[PDB]
Structure 1
Amino acid sequence: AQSFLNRVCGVSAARLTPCGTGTSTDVVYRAFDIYNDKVAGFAKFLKTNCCRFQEKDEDDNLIDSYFVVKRHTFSNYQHEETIYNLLKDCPAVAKHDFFKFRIDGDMVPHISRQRLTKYTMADLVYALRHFDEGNCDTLKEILVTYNCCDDDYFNKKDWYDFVENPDILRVYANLGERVRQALLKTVQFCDAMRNAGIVGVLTLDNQDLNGNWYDFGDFIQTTPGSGVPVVDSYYSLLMPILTLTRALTAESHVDTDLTKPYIKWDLLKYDFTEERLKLFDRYFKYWDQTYHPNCVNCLDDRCILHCANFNVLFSTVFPPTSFGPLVRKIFVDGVPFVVSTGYHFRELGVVHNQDVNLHSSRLSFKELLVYAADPAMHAASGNLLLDKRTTCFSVAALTNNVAFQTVKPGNFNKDFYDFAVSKGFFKEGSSVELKHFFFAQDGNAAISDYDYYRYNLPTMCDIRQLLFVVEVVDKYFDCYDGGCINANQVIVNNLDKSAGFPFNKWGKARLYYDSMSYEDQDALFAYTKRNVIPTITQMNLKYAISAKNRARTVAGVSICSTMTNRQFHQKLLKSIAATRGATVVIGTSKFYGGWHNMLKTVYSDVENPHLMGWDYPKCDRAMPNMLRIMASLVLARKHTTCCSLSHRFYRLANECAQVLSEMVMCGGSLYVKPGGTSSGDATTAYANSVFNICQAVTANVNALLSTDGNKIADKYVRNLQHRLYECLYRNRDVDTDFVNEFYAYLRKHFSMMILSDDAVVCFNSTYASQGLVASIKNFKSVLYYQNNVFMSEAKCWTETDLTKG
């Protein structure tokens, strides 16, 4: 009847309005995270047994707060009652209310909670990580309700895009405070659970956006002072959001309040080792895995990933004028220099040089090279520069006047044109027509293309999923060999190319590859395994035919980088390029029937095939730093015997100092490259392949995990789902048996062909139509929440008649 409604409201705010039927339930689609003994996943299920009431604000207007009430059994009733009685005093628990009503002649029990919010955090996280712009109604409602935007904003089409409409960051960042408060109240909930002696597993689908918690249904009780919270899935699923919405932006104000001035850090202070641990203890107190503020203390590669992931987030709070090399005044032959004696990354903490020799007597040729390539001496003796054309952090000016470089138009070969028009070509209405021309560019063309690095944002990665995608991508590369090679074995083509800055003032690469005997090069390559050498990259424009008027800019890295990177990587690089029948197809020619062999390779044994391909919009500049780091780690993994563990870490640090944040010398003044690959280094064409395979595996993982595991009919793939979730989140160490299992599943139902980001995939289709493998929308979702680019469906094709390739 109606006494139900006046019973539910209880004591406070009896402004109850039914939000459906009466004494019956209310079924809605919500995103859970289920793992019982029969099903895993992070998928939208059908929540049924709950009657939802909405409160009325004054003036008779509907307010954003609800009174849910479940209806379930009798043992869960008392169990819930006891656990709530124990957990009531915490501020981060929503007020329950247990009562018995009657529908027919029986006291059906209820849990009439109070003052909810319509959505949990699980809906927010799912909708951001599983985007589909065709139907994003839940995201629209969640955005409008919390005053982040207004409904009139969504009439501006391509609103969701990141390249177009770059203002959407300002819309998303308005959700930071709610998420930060959720983090804090989760910490307080964990403290209450521990001190109360309760053992339980935490999910996001039991936390309204305000911060409170509920559903103490599957908890168990232990002795007080000895409880344990389980937070592996919660934090790891929530990781990618904390940099979409900048949830830690309120940590740079004077007393962490948004209505205060900014903290003014000291100029010279660069350590920030205590602050990182304080942040970790405040927000991630119960993440029971050691977090090393500086990664030079890490034990192996996976710990380096696990600590770089946290440093990425914690480095966006500290000022960007303290990062970079940490120079030191060194006396040589009675003269003070300024030379780099370390580094300070955002993703690896502080790294110190091991072999530094102040009060040196004389400099060898190796010393002269390693001192004429460091930006410290250059920048520390140049005028300041404040460039308002760009948003990238400028550093200094080496000269007194900037230089403007233009791009000339290509010339005309008239005789061929006359011959063409003689033979009845270029007639109006013909299919063949001129479209590829030599475009021209005005004075400020170089800097207007360097400015595109503004599409690079500090991104967090789902670490407990990357620590498995990296295993599978690793298994994809177990067919080849690699190792360090000596100076007398490197193979270099075209020895008369430029030597970078400032070496291009004296001669081409031949001179520097010539003056060093076969012992100087090895001395340098063994020096870099215990030191860090920052370098200065030049930026040049290409002059080639094209169909689009945008310029193309390529980075000419200095010789001191590629000279050692060749020795480090060349064995593996030339073992990849000399293999036929693999996934990567670098080196396989299309002449003499190679293309036919490739196409018949990728059609291998799939059952109901359907082609699918793609390419990435601005692949080099939209690259996050974590995926670059992981790609370099996967490439350097093969050195299990030739190098130690400190040597491998210092080589990785050198790579990050040379191709990830190196001081680009664009024009006539140094800038700071924020992130992304520089396309003119030694291992671009293979790092891109590693990236592409990583995205493919991530799409497969997301597509298989996020499926309702009660409709899947083939038993084996359901067991695959369950074990996949188990080894992803409920586990900590690699399980090579299941890694082999999943890799076999992939290569049997997802065939691939890869070059540097230009891929082709042949997939079983009657599975992809049931979401057991990656479709072409899954790559859109992954690129959205991980690469920060929206994949337009005018660049991804899909083909179904295999007779045409």
Structure 2
Amino acid sequence: VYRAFDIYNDKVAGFAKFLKRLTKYTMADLVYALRHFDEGNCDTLKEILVTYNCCDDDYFNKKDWYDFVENPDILRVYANLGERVRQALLKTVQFCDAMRNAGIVGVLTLDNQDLNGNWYDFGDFIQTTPGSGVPVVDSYYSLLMPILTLTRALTAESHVDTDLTKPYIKWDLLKYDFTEERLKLFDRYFKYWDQTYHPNCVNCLDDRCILHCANFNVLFSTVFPPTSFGPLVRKIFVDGVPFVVSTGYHFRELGVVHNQDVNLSFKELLVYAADPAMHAASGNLLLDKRTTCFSVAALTNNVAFQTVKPGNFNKDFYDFAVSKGFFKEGSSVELKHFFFAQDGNAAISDYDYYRYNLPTMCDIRQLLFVVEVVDKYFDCYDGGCINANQVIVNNLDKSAGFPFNKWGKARLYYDSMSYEDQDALFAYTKRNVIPTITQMNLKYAISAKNRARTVAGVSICSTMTNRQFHQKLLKSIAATRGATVVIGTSKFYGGWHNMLKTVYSDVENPHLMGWDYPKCDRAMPNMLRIMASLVLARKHTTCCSLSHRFYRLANECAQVLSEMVMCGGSLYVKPGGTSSGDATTAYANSVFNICQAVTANVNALLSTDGNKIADKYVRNLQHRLYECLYRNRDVDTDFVNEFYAYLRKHFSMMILSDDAVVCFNSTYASQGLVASIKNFKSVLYYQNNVFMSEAKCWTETDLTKGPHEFCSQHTMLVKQGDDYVYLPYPDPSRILGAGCFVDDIVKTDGTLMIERFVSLAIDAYPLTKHPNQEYADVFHLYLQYIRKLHDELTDNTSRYWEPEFYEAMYTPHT
């Protein structure tokens, strides 16, 4: 039958399923099952989960059992394997010891370790001087990395003398430095990992070293008590007054970081106020059973409950539409978008969804290669630091965060501090870490789902410093046309057609594909967010030193990745993920999307047989991919360039935040040379820790039709000036809901607002060319209602109800 094997020889290389006492299944089978997940084909995973007393067969009768979101109990089932996996790890170390004592040099693979932990391979072993044996464990540990966190193998370490039966180890609350424990864990488990491991990332040589140390620290942090992690504070005497001020930070991934300019002006007032230390010290203890996340303190005597009001109804527009024959019985066009009211427990409940963010440890070699490939996608952009006078803020009327929201908006704070003060604050952030508090609010939007949506507003200092750090790169990305990232490229004036033509650039057998990330913000692993931040900070090669960039990364982690979050006046600790108020929220999401796509491509290529591939070029490319992944430490620039060119030729991508549209070669995907939907599903399963459903994904065989959906808009080919052109049209239900339902009551009065309907008509004009008549009748209804509103209010305004103005907006003239 077929068994999973990680093979390396001149002929072929890769980790894939090959046709070919000792247990029936090996560790490689488990890792292949858990890294290449197919909902239809879970036979290996099911049997491994049944034979080793993880779950009974009846468990599989329940549907959505594999899904984490629908059935979180699966996390427990996988956890039942962890101990066994842990044992295997220990056994591996023992085996390696023997080899050093036997003077044996060889490579270690998952294929040779039964699930009982015994090693039954002595091949590829060359005898040498006793005591000089050096095993190769890059591939083994690298491939087994995700399962350790997924199965929670190291849970036993949280018990006294490393036994689950005996009670938990009780660490001193005051304790925070676990460097010795991290070194001990590394020496016990990854003793044969030659690369130096730094428990504190402040002593990392480069960004790749930081990523490696953070990857190990993510696993090591689960053992330590949760309360230890967080801001570090000390009491100091200022003006003869006690002040509790933060002097460091404990990161689950970056270890302990101590401020360099600790000492015992307006700038220092911001630094103190934004620090959660004073508020937490002055706040009463809080215990919340409504959520599984850690609760810090309560800053209010009473709990605060916020509700979402019902949407206002525009009677005039609905009556006008009804009189014109719309919204009849059986009509295709119907109201599917509304304002959905919510109770007082909604906000907290949505915060509880952060429970879906689990500690995730990534294949370090694979992640390093993927980030190296991704860096090519951002080479054309130019980035660096800018002074305060070069910072541009679109809107200043927004909130400054807590406690900054109490006293004023952003205008106040930006005017209060001169450019010199802002530069000094930026320099301080380049030398010290400033924890901040972010406030969660409920957004009042027209959604088609009963679920509530929240927006995170970060502190003013975080936004200001992140802007000064990244605005040059962000504007550079927004100012390019024809790149993979399509942020800043409008859909009007032929932008849609230009973008779509750019995607179709030279594909032998073009086929379109799309996807979305379930629970993208909540389930995003911390490691991938760190990788995205490092990628966006790589532009600071000349401007910023290693220490400055490390401290900027620490500030980003403490202000976005893991910060103090206020809900209803109560402070909580965010498990991880990406905040919605970050300066680089969209661009970090784009980097994450590109990283996931590259990882899916790499997994698809390696999972191929290799022998079956009849193309010498692709086989050699796969062999060199394995070389650069699990055999070469230094980055190979030539192969990185070759792989980037291969992806661009056979995998054109439009990436915006999390939405993506791919044009790929059908033959290569069929042969497994390029990633498919199943590869993305598996990637999200073993990395994003979320199950991806095929229902929400779409694949288009004909390029004429165009993408099924992108940016919530559909693509249609129309005829304009003897040229066939792609235009985007929206769902008529969304436009009609926007017209009928308004958030405020002033917008209900049509006379005051004649521009809302103008914008909605500018958006709905492409529907006029749809084969369905009602879709064009939507635009005609909007035009007629605009005319009626103008008449009620009563030459220029004529253009508003004449269709030439709306037609011109979709012509490539401008």
Asked whether the 8 Å contact 2:25–2:115 carries over to 1, the reply is yes
> Once structures 1 and 2 are overlaid, which stretch shifts more, 369-378 or 195-204?
195-204
Q: Aligned partners of 1:573, 1:273: CA distance in 2, in Å?
A: 37
What percentage of aligned pairs have identical amino acids?
A: 100
Length, aligned pairs only: 704
Deviation at 1:252, TM superposition (A): 1.1
Deviation at 1:228, TM superposition (A): 1.6
Asked whether the 8 Å contact 2:3–2:20 carries over to 1, the reply is no
> Once structures 1 and 2 are overlaid, which stretch shifts more, 655-664 or 411-420?
411-420
CA offsets, 1:613-641, max 9 Å, x none? 11111211010000000000000001011
Q: Aligned partners of 1:706, 1:673: CA distance in 2, in Å?
A: 36
Residue 341 of structure 1 aligns to a residue whose secondary structure is strand
Q: Aligned partners of 2:288, 2:19: CA distance in 1, in Å?
A: 57
Residue 7 of structure 2 aligns to a residue whose secondary structure is coil
1:272-671 alignment, distance < 5 Å = 272-357=178-263, 364-671=265-572
CA offsets, 1:218-269, max 9 Å, x none? 2111121221211111111100100010000111111111210000001101
Asked whether the 8 Å contact 2:3–2:19 carries over to 1, the reply is no
Query: Runs ≥4 in structure 1, deviation > 4 angstroms?
Result: none
Q: Aligned partners of 1:283, 1:356: CA distance in 2, in Å?
A: 36
Match of 2:120 in 1: 214
Q: Aligned partners of 2:20, 2:317: CA distance in 1, in Å?
A: 82
Q: Aligned partners of 1:162, 1:140: CA distance in 2, in Å?
A: 16
CA offsets, 1:35-87, max 9 Å, x none? 011100111xxxxxxxxxxxxxxxxxxxxxxxxxxxxxxxxxxxxxxxxxxxx
Residue 41 of structure 1 aligns to a residue whose secondary structure is strand
Deviation at 1:546, TM superposition (A): 1.0
Deviation at 1:469, TM superposition (A): 0.3
Q: Aligned partners of 2:456, 2:411: CA distance in 1, in Å?
A: 19
Match of 1:40 in 2: 13
Distance 1:800 1:113, change over 3 A: closer
1:162 and 2:68 correspond: yes
Asked whether the 8 Å contact 2:511–2:702 carries over to 1, the reply is yes
Deviation at 1:440, TM superposition (A): 0.7
CA offsets, 1:695-750, max 9 Å, x none? 00000000001111111001000000101101111110001010001001010110
CA offsets, 1:102-157, max 9 Å, x none? xxxxxxxxxx9992111111101111111111111111111110111111110011
Deviation at 1:676, TM superposition (A): 0.5
Residue 33 of structure 1 aligns to a residue whose secondary structure is strand
Q: Aligned partners of 1:432, 1:154: CA distance in 2, in Å?
A: 40
Deviation at 1:443, TM superposition (A): 1.3
Q: Aligned partners of 2:528, 2:32: CA distance in 1, in Å?
A: 22
Q: Aligned partners of 1:237, 1:648: CA distance in 2, in Å?
A: 30
CA offsets, 1:473-526, max 9 Å, x none? 001110010111111111111211111111111111100011111111111111
Q: Aligned partners of 2:105, 2:481: CA distance in 1, in Å?
A: 54
Asked whether the 8 Å contact 2:681–2:691 carries over to 1, the reply is yes
Q: Aligned partners of 1:582, 1:197: CA distance in 2, in Å?
A: 53
Q: Aligned partners of 2:440, 2:672: CA distance in 1, in Å?
A: 44
> Once structures 1 and 2 are overlaid, which stretch shifts more, 416-425 or 778-787?
416-425
Asked whether the 8 Å contact 2:2–2:20 carries over to 1, the reply is no
RMSD: 1.6
Residue 489 of structure 2 aligns to a residue whose secondary structure is coil
Residue 620 of structure 1 aligns to a residue whose secondary structure is helix
CA offsets, 1:744-785, max 9 Å, x none? 101011000111111100001111000000011100000000
Deviation at 1:643, TM superposition (A): 1.1
Q: Aligned partners of 1:507, 1:217: CA distance in 2, in Å?
A: 71
Deviation at 1:337, TM superposition (A): 0.5
Q: TM-score, normalised by structure 1?
A: 0.87
Q: Aligned partners of 1:754, 1:114: CA distance in 2, in Å?
A: 41
Q: Aligned partners of 2:19, 2:538: CA distance in 1, in Å?
A: 53
Q: Aligned partners of 1:681, 1:124: CA distance in 2, in Å?
A: 38
Deviation at 1:681, TM superposition (A): 1.5
Q: Larger % of helix: which?
A: 2
**Which of 689, 710, 726 is the equivalent residue of 2:611?**
710
Deviation at 1:538, TM superposition (A): 0.4
Distance 1:113 1:674, change over 3 A: closer
**Which of 681, 687, 691 is the equivalent residue of 1:786?**
687
Q: Aligned partners of 1:234, 1:518: CA distance in 2, in Å?
A: 53
Q: Aligned partners of 1:448, 1:214: CA distance in 2, in Å?
A: 50
Deviation at 1:334, TM superposition (A): 0.6
Q: Aligned partners of 2:551, 2:593: CA distance in 1, in Å?
A: 26
Point out where structure 1 has 5 or more consecutive residues left out of the alignment.
1-27, 44-111, 358-362
Deviation at 1:165, TM superposition (A): 0.9
Deviation at 1:421, TM superposition (A): 1.1
Deviation at 1:196, TM superposition (A): 1.1
Asked whether the 8 Å contact 2:6–2:13 carries over to 1, the reply is yes
Q: Aligned partners of 1:684, 1:559: CA distance in 2, in Å?
A: 16
Deviation at 1:367, TM superposition (A): 0.6
Q: Aligned partners of 1:114, 1:737: CA distance in 2, in Å?
A: 35
Asked whether the 8 Å contact 2:154–2:223 carries over to 1, the reply is yes
Deviation at 1:579, TM superposition (A): 0.7
> Once structures 1 and 2 are overlaid, which stretch shifts more, 385-394 or 486-495?
486-495
Distance 1:113 1:164, change over 3 A: closer
1:690-709 alignment, distance < 5 Å = 690-709=591-610
Deviation at 1:217, TM superposition (A): 2.3
Distance 1:417 1:143, change over 3 A: same
1:29 and 2:2 correspond: yes
Residue 505 of structure 1 aligns to a residue whose secondary structure is helix
Residue 791 of structure 1 aligns to a residue whose secondary structure is coil
Q: Aligned partners of 1:127, 1:430: CA distance in 2, in Å?
A: 47
Distance 1:113 1:740, change over 3 A: closer
Deviation at 1:215, TM superposition (A): 2.4
Deviation at 1:176, TM superposition (A): 1.2
Larger radius of gyration: 1
Q: Aligned partners of 2:368, 2:664: CA distance in 1, in Å?
A: 25
Q: Aligned partners of 1:589, 1:598: CA distance in 2, in Å?
A: 10
Asked whether the 8 Å contact 2:2–2:19 carries over to 1, the reply is no
CA offsets, 1:409-468, max 9 Å, x none? 011111111111111111101111111111110111110111100000000000011110
Match of 1:179 in 2: 85
Q: Aligned partners of 2:505, 2:307: CA distance in 1, in Å?
A: 49
Q: Aligned partners of 2:548, 2:228: CA distance in 1, in Å?
A: 26
Q: Aligned partners of 1:747, 1:205: CA distance in 2, in Å?
A: 34
Distance 1:113 1:262, change over 3 A: farther
Asked whether the 8 Å contact 2:274–2:437 carries over to 1, the reply is yes
Q: Aligned partners of 2:651, 2:386: CA distance in 1, in Å?
A: 35
Deviation at 1:169, TM superposition (A): 0.6
Deviation at 1:213, TM superposition (A): 1.2
**Which of 19, 32, 41 is the equivalent residue of 1:113?**
19
Q: Aligned partners of 1:177, 1:665: CA distance in 2, in Å?
A: 37
Q: TM-score, normalised by structure 2?
A: 0.86
Point out where structure 2 has 5 or more consecutive residues left out of the alignment.
706-814
CA offsets, 1:161-203, max 9 Å, x none? 1000110011110001211111111111111111011111111
Deviation at 1:382, TM superposition (A): 1.1
